Amino acid sequence: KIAERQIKRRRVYKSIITCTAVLKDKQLIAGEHIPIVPVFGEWGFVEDKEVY
Amino acid sequence: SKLMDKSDARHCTVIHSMSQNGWEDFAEKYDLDADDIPSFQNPNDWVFPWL
């Protein structure tokens, strides 16, 4: 162990939720980004509100 | 002047229209008194109802 260093990284947490309670809270996800990959068509913003 | 490139002209006048902050910027750049607001022949009209 040569030394220690502080490295900034992103961690993804998943929490299964309902309208009344959280069944699972902050389950760490492997990925560094949100796994959902969106595909858009005529995407854009008109009045600060998303329109696709 | 009788030439397209205006090379015969012995003088030329360029009218500068600038906002207030532009006026202080111009005065600072050319070392002028920004307090004395300048005036000249108005190159543009007000045919359109600009605010």
Binding site: G44, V46, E47, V51 | S19, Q20, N21, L51
Partner: protein, 52 residues
């Protein structure tokens, strides 16, 4: 102070570019949301308003 000067400059630029920003915002709304730029008469009476 700094606040007054910043607000004066911003107000001058906003007043200078008000018409251009209004026209461009109309262009964005017309080409992105809807081509019926009716805000008052839209609720007065229900009539057919096609989008061709």
């Amino acid at each position: 102070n700094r606040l007054e000067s910043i607000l004066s400059r911003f107000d001058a630029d906003w007043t200078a570019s008000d018409e251009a920003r209004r026209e461009a915002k109309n262009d964005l709304f017309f080409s992105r949301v809807s081509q019926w730029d009716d805000w008052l008469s839209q609720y007065t009476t229900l009539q057919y308003r096609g989008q061709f």
